[PDB]
Amino acid sequence: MSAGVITGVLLVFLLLGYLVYALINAE
Amino acid sequence: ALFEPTLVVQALKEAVKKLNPQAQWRNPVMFIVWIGSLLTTCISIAMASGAMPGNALFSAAISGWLWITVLFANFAEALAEGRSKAQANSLKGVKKTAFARKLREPKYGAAADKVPADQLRKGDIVLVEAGDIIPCDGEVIEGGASVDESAITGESAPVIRESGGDFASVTGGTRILSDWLVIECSVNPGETFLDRMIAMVEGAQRRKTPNEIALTILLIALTIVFLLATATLWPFSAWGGNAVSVTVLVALLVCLIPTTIGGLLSAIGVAGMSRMLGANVIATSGRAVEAAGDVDVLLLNKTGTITLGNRQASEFIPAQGVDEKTLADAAQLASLADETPEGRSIVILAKQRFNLRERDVQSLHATFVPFTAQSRMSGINIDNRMIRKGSVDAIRRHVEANGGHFPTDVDQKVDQVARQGATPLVVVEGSRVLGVIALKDIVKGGIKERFAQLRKMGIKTVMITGDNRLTAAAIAAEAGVDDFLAEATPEAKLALIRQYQAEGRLVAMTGDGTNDAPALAQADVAVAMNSGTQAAKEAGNMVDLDSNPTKLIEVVHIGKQMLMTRGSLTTFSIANDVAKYFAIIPAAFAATYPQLNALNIMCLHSPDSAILSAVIFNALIIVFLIPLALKGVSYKPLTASAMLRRNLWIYGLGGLLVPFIGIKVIDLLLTVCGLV
Amino acid sequence: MAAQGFLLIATFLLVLMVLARPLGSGLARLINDIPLPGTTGVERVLFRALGVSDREMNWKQYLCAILGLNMLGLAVLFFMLLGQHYLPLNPQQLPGLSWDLALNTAVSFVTNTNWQSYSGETTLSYFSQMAGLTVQNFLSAASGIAVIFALIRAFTRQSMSTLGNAWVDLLRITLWVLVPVALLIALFFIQQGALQNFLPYQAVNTVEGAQQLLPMGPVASQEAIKMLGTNGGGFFNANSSHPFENPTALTNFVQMLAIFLIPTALCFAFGEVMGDRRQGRMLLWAMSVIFVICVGVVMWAEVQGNPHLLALGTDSSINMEGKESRFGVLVSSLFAVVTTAASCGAVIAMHDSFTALGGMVPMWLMQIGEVVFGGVGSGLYGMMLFVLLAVFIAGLMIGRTPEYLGKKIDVREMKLTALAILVTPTLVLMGAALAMMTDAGRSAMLNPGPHGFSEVLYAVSSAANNNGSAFAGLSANSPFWNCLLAFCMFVGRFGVIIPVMAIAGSLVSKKSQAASSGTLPTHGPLFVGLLIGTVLLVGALTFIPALALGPVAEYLS
Amino acid sequence: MSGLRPALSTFIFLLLITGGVYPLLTTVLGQWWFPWQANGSLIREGDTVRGSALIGQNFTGNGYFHGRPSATAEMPYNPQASGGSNLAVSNPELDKLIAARVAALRAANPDASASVPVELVTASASGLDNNITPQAAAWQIPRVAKARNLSVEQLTQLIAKYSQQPLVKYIGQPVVNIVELNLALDKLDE
Numbered sequence A: 001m002s003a004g005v006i007t008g009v010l011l012v013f014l015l016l017g018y019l020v021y022a023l024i025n026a027e
Numbered sequence B: 001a002l003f004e005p006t007l008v009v010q011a012l013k014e015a016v017k018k019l020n021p022q023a024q025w026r027n028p029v030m031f032i033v034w035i036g037s038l039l040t041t042c043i044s045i046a047m048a049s050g051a052m053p054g055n056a057l058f059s060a061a062i063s064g065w066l067w068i069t070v071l072f073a074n075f076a077e078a079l080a081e082g083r084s085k086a087q088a089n090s091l092k093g094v095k096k097t098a099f100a101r102k103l104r105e106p107k108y109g110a111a112a113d114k115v116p117a118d119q120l121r122k123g124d125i126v127l128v129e130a131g132d133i134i135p136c137d138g139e140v141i142e143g144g145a146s147v148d149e150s151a152i153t154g155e156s157a158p159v160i161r162e163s164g165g166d167f168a169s170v171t172g173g174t175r176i177l178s179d180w181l182v183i184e185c186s187v188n189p190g191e192t193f194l195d196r197m198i199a200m201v202e203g204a205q206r207r208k209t210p211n212e213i214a215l216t217i218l219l220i221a222l223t224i225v226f227l228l229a230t231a232t233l234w235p236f237s238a239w240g241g242n243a244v245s246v247t248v249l250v251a252l253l254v255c256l257i258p259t260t261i262g263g264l265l266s267a268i269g270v271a272g273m274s275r276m277l278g279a280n281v282i283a284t285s286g287r288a289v290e291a292a293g294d295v296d297v298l299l300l301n302k303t304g305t306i307t308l309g310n311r312q313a314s315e316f317i318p319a320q321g322v323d324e325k326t327l328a329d330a331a332q333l334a335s336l337a338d339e340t341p342e343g344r345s346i347v348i349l350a351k352q353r354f355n356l357r358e359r360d361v362q363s364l365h366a367t368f369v370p371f372t373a374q375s376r377m378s379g380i381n382i383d384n385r386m387i388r389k390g391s392v393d394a395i396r397r398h399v400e401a402n403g404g405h406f407p408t409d410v411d412q413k414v415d416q417v418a419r420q421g422a423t424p425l426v427v428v429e430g431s432r433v434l435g436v437i438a439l440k441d442i443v444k445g446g447i448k449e450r451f452a453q454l455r456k457m458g459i460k461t462v463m464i465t466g467d468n469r470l471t472a473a474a475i476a477a478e479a480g481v482d483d484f485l486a487e488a489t490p491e492a493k494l495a496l497i498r499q500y501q502a503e504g505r506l507v508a509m510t511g512d513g514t515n516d517a518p519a520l521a522q523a524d525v526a527v528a529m530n531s532g533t534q535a536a537k538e539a540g541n542m543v544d545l546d547s548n549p550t551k552l553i554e555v556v557h558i559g560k561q562m563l564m565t566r567g568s569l570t571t572f573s574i575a576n577d578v579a580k581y582f583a584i585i586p587a588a589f590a591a592t593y594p595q596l597n598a599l600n601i602m603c604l605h606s607p608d609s610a611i612l613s614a615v616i617f618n619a620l621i622i623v624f625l626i627p628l629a630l631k632g633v634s635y636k637p638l639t640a641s642a643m644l645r646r647n648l649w650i651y652g653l654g655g656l657l658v659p660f661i662g663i664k665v666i667d668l669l670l671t672v673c674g675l676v
Numbered sequence C: 001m002a003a004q005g006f007l008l009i010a011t012f013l014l015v016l017m018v019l020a021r022p023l024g025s026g027l028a029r030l031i032n033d034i035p036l037p038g039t040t041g042v043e044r045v046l047f048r049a050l051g052v053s054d055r056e057m058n059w060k061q062y063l064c065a066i067l068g069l070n071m072l073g074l075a076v077l078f079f080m081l082l083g084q085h086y087l088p089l090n091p092q093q094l095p096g097l098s099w100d101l102a103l104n105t106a107v108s109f110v111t112n113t114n115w116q117s118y119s120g121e122t123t124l125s126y127f128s129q130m131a132g133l134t135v136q137n138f139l140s141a142a143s144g145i146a147v148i149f150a151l152i153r154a155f156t157r158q159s160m161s162t163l164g165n166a167w168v169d170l171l172r173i174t175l176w177v178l179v180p181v182a183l184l185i186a187l188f189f190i191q192q193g194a195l196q197n198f199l200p201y202q203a204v205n206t207v208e209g210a211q212q213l214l215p216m217g218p219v220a221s222q223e224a225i226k227m228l229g230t231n232g233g234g235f236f237n238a239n240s241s242h243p244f245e246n247p248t249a250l251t252n253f254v255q256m257l258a259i260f261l262i263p264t265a266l267c268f269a270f271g272e273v274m275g276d277r278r279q280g281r282m283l284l285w286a287m288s289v290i291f292v293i294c295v296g297v298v299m300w301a302e303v304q305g306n307p308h309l310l311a312l313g314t315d316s317s318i319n320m321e322g323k324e325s326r327f328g329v330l331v332s333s334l335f336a337v338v339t340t341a342a343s344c345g346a347v348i349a350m351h352d353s354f355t356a357l358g359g360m361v362p363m364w365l366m367q368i369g370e371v372v373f374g375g376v377g378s379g380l381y382g383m384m385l386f387v388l389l390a391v392f393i394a395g396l397m398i399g400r401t402p403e404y405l406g407k408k409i410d411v412r413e414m415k416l417t418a419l420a421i422l423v424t425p426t427l428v429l430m431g432a433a434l435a436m437m438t439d440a441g442r443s444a445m446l447n448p449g450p451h452g453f454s455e456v457l458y459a460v461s462s463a464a465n466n467n468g469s470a471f472a473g474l475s476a477n478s479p480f481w482n483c484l485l486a487f488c489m490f491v492g493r494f495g496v497i498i499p500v501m502a503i504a505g506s507l508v509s510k511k512s513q514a515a516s517s518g519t520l521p522t523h524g525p526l527f528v529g530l531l532i533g534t535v536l537l538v539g540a541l542t543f544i545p546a547l548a549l550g551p552v553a554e555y556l557s
Numbered sequence D: 001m002s003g004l005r006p007a008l009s010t011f012i013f014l015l016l017i018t019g020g021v022y023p024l025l026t027t028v029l030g031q032w033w034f035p036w037q038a039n040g041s042l043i044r045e046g047d048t049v050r051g052s053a054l055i056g057q058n059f060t061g062n063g064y065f066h067g068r069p070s071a072t073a074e075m076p077y078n079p080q081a082s083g084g085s086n087l088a089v090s091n092p093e094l095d096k097l098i099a100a101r102v103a104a105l106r107a108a109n110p111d112a113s114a115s116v117p118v119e120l121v122t123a124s125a126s127g128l129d130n131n132i133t134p135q136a137a138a139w140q141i142p143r144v145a146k147a148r149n150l151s152v153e154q155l156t157q158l159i160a161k162y163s164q165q166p167l168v169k170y171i172g173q174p175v176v177n178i179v180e181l182n183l184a185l186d187k188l189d190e
C-alpha cells in the first residue's frame, strides 16, 4: 500500500542499527 | 623487495572475489558499499525487466562501478595480504631437514638417528658438524665457529658464533661450516619467534590495534551521518517536486562514505607488519609497533650495544722528560708480542701517530713474552733492561722489587687518566718509567650519527654503564647522549624504568641478554636481538634479526608512518567530499530544482555524466592510492607543529583540490568517448 | 554601512571580552573547590540546612543528580502548566493548557531549548511565567553550567574518580552567578523601559478611539535570566522584538552581551583552571572567527535584501520586513547571528522574513551543533567534542597517540565522542523527514516553494539543537508537532549530557602528562585553523544536501 | 544513589529563591525605583489612558504621522497577538502586500516623492512598532502640513524634538515616538 517507502525506511533503520551496533562493538 | 609482481597480484586477484560474501561485514564501510551495490543491482535488474521505468543502463553502470569499488578495496587488502604472505614464505622454509643426531653424550663420541625435529623436543643436545643444518634454536654450550645465518637474517657477510658467555645463541634454519658444535633444543620448535610470526601472518586472523579501532569508530560515525544525510533526502525532494531516484541516492551515499580509508585500513596495517618483517624485526602484534611509534625515551646498554670492544688506546700523554716518539717506540717494542685487541689498538695508533711501520724483528735480539694474567703483565726482553706493561699496581710492585720508586709525574698522569675515565697502562723501561697510555673504552660503531638522528627526532637517548660516573660521562659526551647512567644493577635498571613509566611517558629498550628479561617483560618496546638469549627473546616484545642497536629508529619510523598514513588518508577522504557535493548536488536535483543548476562550478556535461564521473573517481582513487598506502607516507623528522603543517598542506589541500581535477578529467573522457 | 557594521562587531567583541574576563576568573574559582570571597559563613549553614555536603561523587551519581533534578523540574512544570487554572495570579482567567502544548513547553523549558509555539499574551497566566518558566530558565542554565563544571573538573583532575558535587555546584551557580547578575540586568531593563508588575491588562482608548488591550506583567525579571542563561523564549510572542521586552538599543546591546557573557566566561575559566590561559584563548579564537565571518555574511545579505523592493516602488533595498525600526538592519543581523550561534533562541527580527542567504547562516550555525559561543556550558562541551576529534586526527597526523592537555584519548572516549557528535544530526535528519512525510507536518507551512521545507528544517534543528529560535511562520501548535519537537528537544539535550558525562568520568581516571617538548601544541594559530576547519567541515558535510533544497534553492531561485 | 532529600531540598529551595524571591524582589525594586517605566510607561490625562509610549497604535487618519504597517492577528497594532509577517523574501503574497502598501502610500501622498521609504511599506518584527526613522518621517511632512494648516519648519522642530537617537550612532537607529508625536501634535493644534 506504501511500497517504495515502507521498505526504504525499514532498510535505512536496519542499516542504522547495524552501523550503531558496529560503533558499540569492537569486532 | 617486491615491486608489485604479476606472479602474485593475479594470484591474489583470484582470492579477491572470495572476500565478497561474508568477509565484508567485518568492515562496516565496505559492507554498506556492498549492500548499496547489491541494492542498485537489484534495482537495475527490476528496471530493465520492465517493473520500474527509466534509464536502466545508467543504473547498471552505477551498479557495476560500485561493485568495482568493492573489488578495488578488497584488491588493496588482498595485495597487502599477499605481499605479507610472500615475505613470510620467503623467510620460512629455507631448508627443512629431519636429521636429528639423536644422542646422549655431548662429547665427540656419540651416535645419531633420523628423528624429526617435531619429535626432538624440550632441551635435547644436538651435535652438529661442518656443512650441516642447525635444527632449532638454542645456545652453544660447547664449540664456537663461523655460522651462516644469511638465510634467516638476510645478511651476506659471515658471522662468527662465539660459544659461551656472549654469543650463546643459535637459530633454526642456519648453517655451520667451520667446526663441530653442540646445540640445545631449549624452547619447542613451533613456539619460536619465526613460528609465531608465521602464525600471526598466515592463517590466524590478526587483531586490530586500538588506534585502528578508534579510527574505525570515527569512520562509522561519519558513514552514519552520511547515511542520514543521503537518505532522508527522498522525503526532502518529494515535497520539492519529482522524487529523486534511489540509484542516484546510493551513488551519492557511496561517494560520500569514507571508502578511501575504509577499504585501506587493513592494507595499511598489513603493509606496516610487512615493513616490520622486511626490516628484520619480528613483532607479534601491531599494537607493539604503534606503541613504539610513541615512545620518548631509549634505554640501551654499552657492553656490546655501543662500545663494540674493550678499553683501547685513544691518546698518549707524556708528562716530563720523555718525548712522544721515543715513548711510542718503546711502547711498540713492549707491545710487539700482544695479540689482545687493546694491543692491536696500541699498535695501530702508534703507527698512525709516528709512522712506526717497518721493524727489523731479526736484529731485535729479544725474546717475545706473551700476556700472562698470573703476573698480569706483558712485554719483551729488548734490552738489558726489561720492558713490561700491565696493571698499575703490578707495575708498581715489580718496579719496587727491581729497586725503583713511583714517580710523581707518572702518578699524576695515572690519576688524570682515572678521572678522565680510562684504564691506565704504563710502559716502564728498566728502573725508569717513560709514560702512561690512556685507554678509554672505544665506541667505533658509528652510533653518534644515529644518536644525532634520534635527537632530531626528539627521543631521550638514556645510556647506561656499569662503571663509575666519570668514565660514563666522558664516553657519553663522545657518544652524544643526553643522559648517562652508572653502576648498573638490575634493581636500579627496573627502578629507572618504573620512574620513567610512572612519570607518564612510554619506554623503549633493546636488551639482549637474559639478565634484563624482567626489564623486557616490564618494557613496552623490548627490542631483543638475534644474538641475544632465547629466554630474553621469548620474554621480550620484539626480535631484531639484524642484531643492530640502531634498529629502533627504523621501528619508530615505520610505527609513525602507519599512523601518519591512516590519518592522512582519513583527512583525504573527509576533505574529498566537497567535490562530490559540487558534482552531484547540482546534478541529482537538476530535473526537480533547476534553480540550483548553477552550482556545478566544474561545468560538467550532463547530470548522468556528473554522477558517473563522481562514482568512477571514487572507484579509481582507491587504486591510485594503493601505492601510497603500501609504501607509507614520506617520514621527515620535523617539529610537532610543522609535520602537521606539511601533512595538512599535502593531504587536506589534496582532498580539496585533486577531486576537482579528477572528476573534470573523468567527465571529459566520458564526453570524448561518446558515452554521454 | 559596512564600516558601521564592522565597528559594531568590534565594539561588541571588545566589551564582551572586557566584561567576561573577571566573570571568567569567578567561574574558574567556582570550578575549583574554593568558594567565592565573603560567602563561606552562609555557605556552610545553607548546605547544613539542605543536607548537601561530604558528597564527592563520580560521573554516575553526578549525572543521576542532574537528570533527577531535570525530571523533577519537568514534572513540576508540566503539572503547573496543565493545572494553571486553579493556581493564583489569573488576571485574564486564562485556562489550563492542553496536554500536547503543556508537555511541549514543559520539555522546552527544562531542556534549555525554550521553543514557544504559543503566545504568552493570551496563553499563560502570570504565576506560570513567573514561578515555573523563570525557575526552569534558571535551572536548565544551572544544569548546563554544572555539567560543564564536571567536564572541566575531569580535565583538571589527575587520578581520582570523583568529579564533584552536583547539588553544591547548582546552588553556587544559581545563587552567585545567575541571580546577582540577573538583578543588575533586570533593573537596567526597568531603568530603560521594560516593565515588571502584576497589574491586570490595561485597556487603552487610543487617539482613533479603537479599544486596545496592553499585556502587563513580570517581564524584565524573566527577560534577565532569559538572556543571561542563554535561555530565550519571551514573555510575549515576539521574543525580543517587543518594545515592552527590549525597548532600546542600549537594552539590546546589554542583551547581546548577556547572551555571550557566560560562554566566554566559561572559556576564560577553562583557560584559568587548566593552568595556561592560551588553551582558553585558542577556543575563543576558534569560536570568534566563525562568529565574525557568519555575522559579516548575514549583514551583507540583509543589506542586499529584497531585490523586488525597488521594482515595487520603494527607495532602499534593505530587507526591513520583519525587522524593527528601533534596531537597524545591521543590529538585527548581529542579534540573529548571536542568538542563533549561542543557542539562545530569542529574536529581535523574525527569522522567517529573511533573505535566503542571510537565513541560511543562522540555520547552518544550528546545523553544525551549537559550538560558536553556544549554550550556557552546553555549547562548551559541544565544542569540546570537536576539540577531542581535532586532537585525535592531529595525533594521527603527527604519528603519536592522541592527546589533549596531557590526558590520552582512546576508544573509550572515542565511542562516546562519536555518539555525542551524531546524536543531534540524527535527530535533525529524522525529524525533518518525519515532518515532511506526515500530512499534519507538511500542512503547517506558511511560505510556498523551498522556504516551507526551510521552515521545517529550521524548526526541527532548533528543537534538536536546544536553540528555540523559530521561522515563526510554522504553525507548530499541532499535537504531532508538539510531540515530535518535545522528543527532539528531550533526546538532543539528554543524549548529549549523558555521553559528555561518560567522557568526563572516563577522563578523570587517567593521569595527565607533561609537554615533553615533542607533543602537538594545542594553543596556536595552526590548531585554531584546524579546529575551525574540523567544525565547518563536519557541519557542512552532513547538511549541505539538506540546505541545498531549502535556503540555497531559494537564493538561486 | 539515595539522595531524594538532597534532591527535593535543593529543588524546593531553588524554586523558592528564583520564583517567589527573585521576581518579588525585582518587582519591589522596580516599582520603588522606576514606577512609571515598570508600569508599562503609560500616558495619562483626565484619568484616561492614551496608550503607552512604547507600543504604538494603528493611526489611519489623514492628519497623523503613520507608523510602520502591522501584521497582528485580528486588527493592526493588536498587543494581544504580537509577531509580524513571517513571509519569506520570495513570497508572491508578500510582493502583492508591498505593492498594495506602496500604491496606497503614493495615492495618499501626492506632494511627497515617489521613492517611498522601506519602513512605511514593510511590516514590523513584533507586529507593533511606535518608531520610524526621521528620514522616513520627513517624507510625510507636506501631507500633514497641508492637512492641518501647519508649516514644514515647525513640523521639523516637532520631529527633532520627539526624536530619540541612541547613545552610540551605530548600535541602533535614530527613531521618533509616533504616539508621543501625535499627542503633542494634537495638543499643539488644539
Ligand SMILES: CCCCCCCCCCCCCCCCCC(=O)OC[C@H](COP(=O)([O-])OCC(O)COP(=O)([O-])OC[C@@H](COC(=O)CCCCCCCCCCCCCCCCC)OC(=O)CCCCCCCCCCCCCCCCC)OC(=O)CCCCCCCCCCCCCCCCC
Pocket (backbone or CB within 6 Å): C006, C009, C010, C011, C013, C014, C017, C018, C281, C284, C285, C288, C289, C292, C293
Ligand atoms: C569586506 C571584508 C572586510 C574584512 C574585515 C576583516 C577585519 C578583521 C580584523 C581582525 C583584527 C585582528 C583581531 C583583533 C585583535 C586581536 C586581539 C587579541 O589577540 O587579544 C589577545 C589578548 C592578549 O593576548 P597576548 O598578546 O598573547 O598577551 C598575553 C597576556 O598574557 C594576556 O594579557 P591580556 O589578555 O590581559 O591583555 C591586556 C590588554 C590590556 O588590558 C585591558 O584591560 C584593555 C582592554 C582589554 C580588551 C581585550 C579585548 C580582546 C579582544 C579584542 C578584539 C576586538 C576586535 C574584534 C573584532 C575585530 C574583527 C571584526 O591588552 C590587549 O590584549 C587588548 C588588545 C586590544 C585589541 C585592539 C582591538 C583590535 C583592533 C580592531 C578594531 C580597530 C580596527 C580599525 C581598523 C581596521 C582596518 C580596516 O588576550 C585577551 O585579551 C583575550 C581575548 C581572546 C580572544 C581573542 C578575540 C579575537 C576576536 C577577533 C576575531 C576576528 C577574527 C576574524 C577576522 C577574519 C578571519 C581572519
Ligand SMILES: CCCCCCCCCCCCCCCCCC(=O)OC[C@H](COP(=O)([O-])OCC(O)COP(=O)([O-])OC[C@@H](COC(=O)CCCCCCCCCCCCCCCCC)OC(=O)CCCCCCCCCCCCCCCCC)OC(=O)CCCCCCCCCCCCCCCCC
Pocket (backbone or CB within 6 Å): B571, B574, B575, B641, B642, B645, B646, B648, B649, B652, B653, B656, C285, C289, C389, C393, C521, C523, C524, C525, C526, C527, C528, C529, C530, C532, C533, C534, C537
Ligand atoms: C585545506 C587547507 C590546508 C591548509 C594547510 C596550511 C598549512 C600551512 C599553514 C601556513 C603556514 C606557512 C608555513 C609557516 C610559515 C610561518 C607562519 C607563522 O608565522 O606561523 C603561523 C602558523 C604556524 O603557527 P604554529 O604552527 O602553531 O607554531 C608557530 C608559532 O606558534 C607561531 O608564532 P606565535 O604563535 O608563537 O606568535 C605569533 C603571534 C604574534 O607574533 C608575531 O607578531 C609574528 C606573527 C605576526 C602575525 C600577524 C600579527 C598579528 C598577531 C595577532 C594575532 C592575530 C593573528 C591574525 C588574525 C587575523 C588578522 C587579520 O601571533 C599569533 O598568531 C598568536 C595568537 C594566538 C593564536 C590566535 C589564533 C589566530 C587565528 C587563526 C585563524 C585561522 C583561520 C583560517 C581560516 C579557516 C581555514 C580552515 O601557520 C599558519 O598560518 C596556520 C594558520 C592557517 C591554518 C589553516 C590550516 C587548517 C586548514 C585545514 C582544515 C582541514 C581539516 C580536516 C579535518 C577533517 C576532519 C577530521
Ligand SMILES: [K+]
Pocket (backbone or CB within 6 Å): B218, B221, B222, C418, C421, C422
Ligand atoms: K563524527
Ligand SMILES: [K+]
Pocket (backbone or CB within 6 Å): B254, B255, B256, B257, B258, B259, B260, B573, B576, B618
Ligand atoms: K569517498
Ligand SMILES: [K+]
Pocket (backbone or CB within 6 Å): C112, C113, C114, C230, C231, C232, C343, C344, C345, C466, C467, C468
Ligand atoms: K535556548
Ligand SMILES: [K+]
Pocket (backbone or CB within 6 Å): C114, C115, C116, C232, C233, C234, C239, C345, C346, C467, C468, C469, C470
Ligand atoms: K524561542
Ligand SMILES: [K+]
Pocket (backbone or CB within 6 Å): C369, C370, C382, C424, C496
Ligand atoms: K551539539
Ligand SMILES: [K+]
Pocket (backbone or CB within 6 Å): C370, C378, C382, C465, C466, C492, C493, C496
Ligand atoms: K546541545
Ligand SMILES: [K+]
Pocket (backbone or CB within 6 Å): C367, C368, C369, C421, C425, C538, C539, C542
Ligand atoms: K555534525
